[PDB]
Amino acid sequence: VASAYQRFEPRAYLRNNYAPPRGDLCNPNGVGPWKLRCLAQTFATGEVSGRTLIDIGSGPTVYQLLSACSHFEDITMTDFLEVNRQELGRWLQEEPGAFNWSMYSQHACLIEGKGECWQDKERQLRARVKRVLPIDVHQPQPLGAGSPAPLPADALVSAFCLEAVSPDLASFQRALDHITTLLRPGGHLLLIGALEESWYLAGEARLTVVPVSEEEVREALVRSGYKVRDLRTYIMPAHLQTGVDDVKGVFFAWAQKV
């Protein structure tokens, strides 16, 4: 795995999953609106709050934190690759060539229904993101020892990471335990991932994925000592099946550490 990700191309990844058609948020039945809606509805309950939040395996994306940013003042973004942390930086600093997340910011504002302009939303996200750290979910201590990230975190967010970096279920379970050590007791985990997928492309890189089911995800969460508050499934429509992968569905889980 670690070897495969060496050819991971952030620009090709973003283009494959966050540019039209999947990146076309106008159709409410798409995977993007669905993910944003799951994240928005969860935070809207007001039951997921605190001071610090860690995003596990952020890669070069920020959509997963658009609704979250208004509930946590200290946000930590992370990733295995330096190239991704660099791409993130370009957007956080508003540097040349940053990826345009404005459509997602606008829809998150639309979905949240607080009449917030998307520039304010992006402003808050850039402000509350205090650091982009390297990470390895396979190490018992993902962030290492003595990381600037406040621990234990109040909340964790991770999208398309674990299943995309573990050769099989077992590795998936350990990686889950590994990041859970970063979550404060009683804390919350918002996990999004691919269902029954086995590979996806990112430029020259061809990544293996462990095909997981909703039950396998639920059981793994429980085994890690979580209380599954909510677990949803989104079936990938034919129109969003483009050749960049073989994903069948997408899952969203809101688990609380007990």
Ligand X SMILES: N[C@H]1CCc2ccccc2[C@H]1O
Residues 9-68 that bind ligand X (CB under 6 A): 17, 22, 31
Helix, strand, or coil (residue 83): helix
For ligand X, the closer of residues 89 and 211 by Cβ is: 211
Q: Are 64 and 58 in contact (CB under 8 A)?
A: yes
Q: Which stretch binds ligand X (CB under 6 A): 3-11, 41-49, 135-143, 193-201?
A: 193-201
Region for 27 from its dihedrals, namely left if φ exceeds 0, alpha if ψ lies in -120 to 50, beta otherwise: beta
Tell me the residue nearest to ligand SAH as measured from the CB: 59
105 is in an annotated binding site: no
Task: Tell which one of 42, 61, 76, 173 touches ligand SAH (CB under 6 A).
Answer: 61
Binding residues for ligand X, how many (CB under 6 A)? 11
For ligand SAH, the closer of residues 7 and 223 by Cβ is: 7
DSSP state of 55: E
Distance, in Å, from the CA atom of 122 to the CA atom of 15, rounded to the nearest integer, reads 20
Contacts of 99 (CB under 8 A, 6+ apart): 11, 14, 18, 60, 87, 90, 91
137 is in an annotated binding site: yes
Distance, in Å, from the CA atom of 223 to the CA atom of 219, rounded to the nearest integer, reads 6
Task: Tell which one of 84, 147, 224, 256 touches ligand SAH (CB under 6 A).
Answer: 84
Contacts of 50 (CB under 8 A, 6+ apart): 71, 72, 153, 154, 155, 184, 187
Task: Tell which one of 88, 109, 164, 175 touches ligand X (CB under 6 A).
Answer: 164
Task: Tell which one of 159, 209, 212, 220 touches ligand SAH (CB under 6 A).
Answer: 159
Q: Which stretch binds ligand SAH (CB under 6 A): 26-34, 44-52, 158-166, 234-242?
A: 158-166
The closest of 61, 54, 74 to 129, measured between CA atoms, is 74
Residues in contact with ligand SAH by the rule CB under 6 A: 5, 8, 57-59, 61, 64, 79-81, 84, 135-138, 159-161, 164-165
